[PDB]
Design a binder for these strands. Structure first.
Ligand SMILES: Nc1ncnc2c1ncn2[C@@H]1O[C@H](COP(=O)(O)OP(=O)(O)OP(=O)(O)O)[C@@H](O)[C@H]1O
Ligand SMILES: [Ca+2]
Ligand SMILES: [Ca+2]
Ligand SMILES: [Ca+2]
Ligand SMILES: [Ca+2]
Ligand SMILES: [Ca+2]
Length: 901
DNA sequence: TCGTGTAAGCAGTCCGCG
DNA sequence: GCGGACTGTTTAC
C-alpha cells in the first residue's frame, strides 16, 4: 500500500508524525524538518519559484523551524513580505505525501469513550477534578471491543461487580437491555481502587493509542477531567501520557462573552461528536443531550433511571455501568448512520491537514490551495492583517403575502461556486476594474458592456480569461465530488419512494429483502421483485434505502458546505486570500443573476400567455425563483386532468421542455454580456407545488420574505408517493417553537394547503379545546441563554432583561441553596414557560435546562402556575393568525345568514 | 457558541404618540 | 396598542 499519515505535530524543531507505513503497521517518527520559505528576488535572478502573480522568488531553506519563524518576524520588522507556508507541519505533509492520499480506515484507531464521575456537591468541574472517576467505557475500532473500567470502591460507595447477564436481560426482567449485538464485545475490568483503574487505563491507552478520539462532549468534559484527575493524583508527567509524544497544552477557548479550557493532546486528533454533529448534521436542536439526540437520530427510548445521577451509582451500580456502555454505543450508532467520522477523514486527507482542522474551512482551503500551487512551483502569499468591514450579500425579493395555488420553483446549482467558476474569480486572476453603472442597468441590459477582453462581475471587477485561477480550479474538484454523492443521495430517495408505493400492496408471504445498491435507480427486474415482497421485507428495504440516502446526504451537503465556505472565506479577514473585491464580485453577480433571470422568465411567460407586464415570478431569494403556474394550468383547464399526478406530469414536462430552455438562453446572454469565461448558471426546476386535484386546498402561501409553505409533489425529480410540505421560516421550522406547537401548526398548514379553510377550522377548534392536557415540556418554548450575568442584579432582572433570561433568574432564586439542583449553563439552551399572576416564583416566567425535567422541588408548582392562555396565544394563535391572514383565510368560522336556521 | 459569508424573520424591552 | 430603536436570537440562503 501507499503510506499515509495519521497525526502530525510541530514540537520545537521536530515534526512528530504517526503514520501507517507500506506494510500497514502503525509507526511514529521524529523528523528534524528543515522548512523552506520565500522572498521576492530580482528578475536577473534565475529561479523556478514564482508567486501567484508571476513575480520571481528565491527559496530560503532554514536550518530549522524556529529559524524560519525568527525570519518571518524580522521580515515584518524590515517591512517585507515573507512568502510560503508558514504552518510548517502542512509543508511537511505536502513534502512527505506528495500524491493523492489513499487511506485505509481499518488501520486507523478510532476511540469512542465516556467517563462517569459521582458528585454530591453539584456538577464536577473538569478543571478541579476533585471527585473519583468511577467508570470508563472505551470502545476501540480496531479491536471492535468495549473496554469497561469499573471502580468498585470509593469514598461515595462500595459496590459489587457489574453483571453482564443482568445487563443483557430485558428492562421488563429488571435488566438493562444492553444490546445483544455488543454483549460479546464487552471486556469488563473491575478495580479495587481508583489509582489502579487509572494506571491500568494509561497502560491500555499506551497499547491502544487513539488516533481519532471522539465521544459526547469529550473535549469539554471527559478529556480534561481525565487529564486533571490523573494530574492531581499522580502529577503532570503521568497525565501527559495521554499524549503519545508526552506534550499537552491547556488551550483556552474564547468567545464574545466568557471562556473555557480544553486540553490539547499532541499526536491525537480529537473530534468531539457533539461538534461533528453541530457542524455536519444541518439540524438545529432544542437540546444536545445524548439521550435527546439519540432519540431523534435512532428512535431509541430515553435511558430511564430513578433518583438523581449523583445517587445512581450507590443505589443501582448495575444500571450505572450499563448506561455508561450504552452511552458509548449510541454515539457509534449515530455515526453508523450519519458517517461524520468517515466524512472527516475524507476531507482531512484530501486537504492534507490535521484531521481536526476539518472544523475550519479556512484552514482546509489554505491547505488545498497551498498543495495545488506547490505542484506548479508557485509560492503562496503571506497572510496580512485586515480590519473587519461589512459587505453586501444576496438579493431577496419582497413577496406579496397571499395564497399561491400552483407554483414551480427553480434555483442555481451550487450558485456561488458556479459564479466563481463562470467569472473566474481568484486572487491571481484579477485583471482590473471598469466603471460600474447602477445594478438595475445591468439587470435590464441597458448598461454599456463592461469589457471586450476580460470576464466581469457587475461590482466592477475584471478577471483574466486565458487560464483558470486556482480557486475556480480547486472549487471545481470538490464540486464534482459533491455532484457525484448527491446523485447517489437522489437515487436512494427515488428508490425510497418506489418501496413506499409497493407498501400499499404488501404480499402475504415469508421472504427476505433483496440485496441491492440503493445508490442506483432500481432496474425493472428489481421493481418486479419488489411488488411481490412482504411488508416486513419492504420495510427493511425502506430503512436501508433511507440509510443510503442519509449517507449520501452527509457526503453531498458538507462538500457543498465546504465550497460555499470558500466563497464565504474570501470575506473573512483571517483567510490568506481575503479580498472584498472578490467576495463582493460573487455576491453582486448573484444579485444581477437572479433579477436578470426574473425579468427573462416574466418576459417569456407573458409571451406564451399573450399578456404584458404580468408578474409570474412571485418570489426569489439569492439564486431562486418561484413561478406562479396558475395560468399554465388554466390554459389546458383543470377538467382535462385525470388526477393530481397528471397535472404534475404536465408541469414537470413544461418546466423541462419550455422553462429551462428559456432560462438557459437568458443566462447565456448574461454570460456573453459579462464576457464570462464559461456558462455555468444552471437553474434546474426544484419543486412542483399545488393542491390535490379537486380539493379545496390552497396549494401554498407566503407571509413575507423567508416565510412560506408549499404542498409539493415533485422535488428535484423525486416523485413522492404522498405529497410533502416544503416549509421555510415559519414556526414549524424553528427550534424555539414548542414541540407540540410545531406539530399542530404543521397540521393546520397541511389542512390549509391540502384540504381548505373548513378542515382548518375543525382542527383549530379542537386544538384550542384540548391543548391544556399537553405535557409541559411539549408546550414549553426554547431559547439559547447568553449573557446571564450581565442582566443579573442581585438575582433579579436588570434593565432590558431578555424574557428567557428573566426565566433563568426566576429559576435560580427558586433553587437557591441547593447543591443538587440542575444549574442552567451559560450559552446553552433552556425551556421557557410563562407564569400566571401572583405565583410563588414572584415573576412572569421560568426557565430551566432544555431536554430535561424540571427538578421535583418546584415541578408541581410550575405545573400549577403555568399560564396556558399566554402560551397558546404567543406560540400558536399569533403565528396562525399570520399564516391565515396572509392566505386570506379564517381560522374561526365567521357568521353567515344560514345561522338563522 | 473556536471553526466561511450576508439577509432577514420574529420576540421582547423601552417608550413615544397629544 | 402599535412602531421605531435596540438587544437577543434563529433561521434561509
Ligand atoms: N452555509 C452557507 N455559507 C455560505 N454561503 C451560503 C451558505 N448557504 C447558502 N449560501 C449561499 O447561497 C447560495 C444558494 O444557497 P443554496 O442553499 O441554494 O446552495 P447552492 O450552493 O446553490 O447548492 P444547491 O445546488 O444544493 O442549491 C449558495 O451557493 C451560497
Ligand atoms: Ca453519564
Ligand atoms: Ca441553489
Ligand atoms: Ca405486492
Ligand atoms: Ca436556492
Ligand atoms: Ca437543483
Amino acid at each position: 500500500m501507499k503510506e499515509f499519515y495519521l497525526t502530525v505535530e510541530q514540537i520545537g524543531d521536530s515534526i512528530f508524525e504517526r503514520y501507517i507505513d507500506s506494510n500497514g503497521r502503525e509507526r511514529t517518527r521524529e523528523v528534524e524538518y528543515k522548512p523552506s520559505l520565500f522572498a521576492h528576488c530580482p528578475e536577473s535572478q534565475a529561479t523556478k519559484y514564482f508567486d501567484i502573480y508571476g513575480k520571481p522568488c528565491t527559496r530560503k531553506l532554514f536550518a530549522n523551524m524556529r529559524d524560519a519563524s525568527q525570519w518571518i518576524k524580522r521580515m515584518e520588522d524590515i517591512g517585507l513580505e515573507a512568502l510560503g507556508m508558514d504552518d510548517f507541519k502542512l509543508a511537511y505533509l505536502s513534502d512527505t505525501y506528495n500524491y493523492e492520499i489513499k487511506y485505509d480506515h481499518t488501520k486507523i484507531r478510532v476511540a469512542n469513550f465516556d467517563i462517569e464521575v459521582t458528585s454530591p456537591d453539584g456538577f464536577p468541574e473538569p478543571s478541579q477534578a476533585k471527585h473519583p472517576i468511577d467508570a470508563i467505557t472505551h470502545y476501540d475500532s480496531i479491536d471492535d471491543r468495549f473496554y469497561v473500567f469499573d471502580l468498585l470502591n470509593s469514598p461515595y460507595g462500595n459496590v459489587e461487580e457489574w453483571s453482564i447477564e443482568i445487563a443483557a436481560k430485558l428492562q421488563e426482567q429488571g435488566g438493562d437491555e444492553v444490546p445483544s449485538e455488543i454483549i460479546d464485545k464487552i471486556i469488563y475490568m473491575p478495580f479495587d481502587n481508583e489509582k489502579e483503574l487509572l494506571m491500568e487505563y494509561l497502560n491500555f491507552w499506551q497499547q491502544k493509542t487513539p488516533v481519532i478520539l471522539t465521544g459526547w462532549n469529550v473535549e469539554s468534559f471527559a478529556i480534561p477531567y481525565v487529564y486533571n484527575r490523573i494530574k492531581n493524583i499522580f502529577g503532570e508527567s503521568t497525565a501527559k501520557r495521554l499524549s503519545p509524544h508526552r506534550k499537552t497544552r491547556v488551550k483556552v477557548i474564547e468567545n464574545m462573552y466568557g471562556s473555557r479550557e480544553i486540553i490539547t493532546l499532541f499526536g491525537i486528533s480529537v473530534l468531539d461528536y457533539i461538534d461533528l454533529y453541530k457542524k455536519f448534521s444541518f439540524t438545529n436542536q432544542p437540546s444536545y443531550s445524548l439521550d435527546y439526540i439519540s432519540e431523534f437520530e435512532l428512535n431509541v427510548g430515553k435511558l430511564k433511571y430513578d433518583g438523581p445521577i449523583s445517587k445512581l451509582r450507590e443505589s443501582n451500580h448495575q444500571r450505572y455501568i450499563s448506561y455508561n456502555i450504552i452511552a458509548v454505543y449510541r454515539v457509534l450508532q449515530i455515526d453508523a448512520k450519519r458517517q461524520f467520522i468517515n466524512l472527516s477523514l475524507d476531507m482531512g486527507y484530501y486537504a492534507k491537514i490535521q484531521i481536526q482542522s476539518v472544523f475550519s474551512p479556512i484552514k482546509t482551503w489554505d491547505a488545498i490551495i497551498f498543495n495545488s500551487l506547490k505542484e506548479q512551483n508557485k509560492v503562496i502569499p503571506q497572510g496580512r492583517s485586515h480590519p473587519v468591514q461589512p459587505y453586501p450579500g444576496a438579493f431577496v425579493k419582497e413577496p406579496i403575502p397571499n395564497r399561491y395555488k400552483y407554483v414551480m420553483s427553480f434555483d442555481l446549482t451550487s450558485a456561488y461556486p458556479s459564479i466563481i467558476r463562470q467569472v473566474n474569480i481568484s486572487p491571481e486572476t484579477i485583471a482590473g476594474t471598469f466603471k460600474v453603472a447602477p445594478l438595475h442597468d445591468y439587470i435590464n441590459a441597458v448598461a454599456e458592456r463592461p469589457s471586450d477582453v476580460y470576464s466581469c462581475s457587475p461590482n466592477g471587477m475584471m478577471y483574466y480569461k486565458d487560464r483558470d485561477g486556482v480557486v475556480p480550479t480547486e472549487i471545481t474538484k470538490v464540486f464534482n465530488q459533491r455532484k457525484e454523492h448527491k446523485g447517489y443521495m437522489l437515487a436512494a430517495q427515488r428508490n425510497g419512494e418506489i418501496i413506499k408505493e409497493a407498501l400499499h400492496n404488501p404480499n402475504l408471504s415469508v421472504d427476505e429483502p433483496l440485496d441491492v445498491d440503493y445508490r442506483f435507480d432500481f432496474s425493472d427486474e428489481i421493481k418486479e421483485k419488489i411488488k411481490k415482497l412482504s411488508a416486513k421485507s419492504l420495510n427493511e428495504m425502506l430503512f436501508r434505502a433511507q440509510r443510503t440516502e442519509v449517507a449520501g446526504m452527509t457526503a453531498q451537503i458538507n462538500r457543498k458546505a465546504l465550497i460555499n465556505g470558500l466563497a464565504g472565506a474570501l470575506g473573512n479577514v483571517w483567510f490568506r486570500y481575503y479580498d472584498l473585491r472578490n467576495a463582493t464580485a460573487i455576491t453582486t453577480f448573484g444579485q444581477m443573476a437572479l433579477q436578470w433571470i426574473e425579468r427573462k422568465v416574466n418576459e417569456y411567460l407573458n409571451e406564451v400567455c399573450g399578456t404584458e407586464g404580468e408578474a409570474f415570478v412571485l418570489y426569489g431569494d439569492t439564486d431562486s425563483i418561484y413561478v406562479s403556474a396558475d395560468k399554465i394550468i388554466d390554459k389546458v383547464g383543470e377538467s382535462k386532468f385525470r388526477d393530481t399526478n397528471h397535472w404534475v406530469d404536465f408541469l414537470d414536462k413544461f418546466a423541462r421542455e419550455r422553462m429551462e430552455p428559456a432560462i438557459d438562453r437568458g443566462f447565456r446572454e448574461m454570460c456573453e454580456y459579462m464576457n464570462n469565461k464559461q456558462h455555468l448558471m444552471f437553474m434546474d426546476r426544484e419543486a412542483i407545488a399545488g393542491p390535490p386535484l379537486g380539493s379545496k386546498g390552497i396549494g401554498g402561501f407566503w407571509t413575507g420574505k423567508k416565510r412560506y409553505a408549499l404542498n409539493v409533489w415533485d422535488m428535484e425529480g423525486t416523485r413522492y408517493a404522498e405529497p410533502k410540505l416544503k416549509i421555510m421560516g415559519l414556526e414549524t421550522q424553528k427550534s424555539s417553537t414548542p414541540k407540540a406547537v410545531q406539530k399542530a401548526l404543521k397540521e393546520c398548514i397541511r389542512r390549509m394547503l391540502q384540504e381548505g379553510e373548513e378542515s382548518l377550522q375543525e382542527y383549530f377548534k379542537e386544538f384550542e379545546k384540548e391543548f391544556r392536557q399537553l405535557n409541559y415540556i411539549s408546550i414549553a418554548s426554547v431559547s439559547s441563554a447568553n449573557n446571564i450575568a450581565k442582566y443579573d442584579v442581585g438575582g433579579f432582572p436588570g434593565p432590558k432583561c431578555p424574557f428567557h433570561i428573566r426565566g433563568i433568574l426566576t429559576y435560580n432564586r427558586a433553587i437557591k441553596g441547593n447543591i443538587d439542583a440542575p444549574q442552567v449553563v451559560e450559552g446553552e439552551k433552556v425551556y421557557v414557560l410563562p407564569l400566571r399572576e401572583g405565583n410563588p416564583f414572584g415573576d412572569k416566567c421560568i426557565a430551566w435546562p432544555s431536554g430535561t425535567e424540571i427538578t421535583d422541588l418546584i415541578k408541581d408548582d410550575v405545573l400549577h402556575w403555568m399560564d396556558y392562555t399566554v402560551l397558546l396565544e404567543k406560540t400558536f394563535i399569533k403565528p396562525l393568525e399570520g399564516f391565515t391572514s396572509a392566505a386570506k383565510l379564517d381560522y374561526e368560522k365567521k357568521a353567515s345568514l344560514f345561522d338563522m336556521f
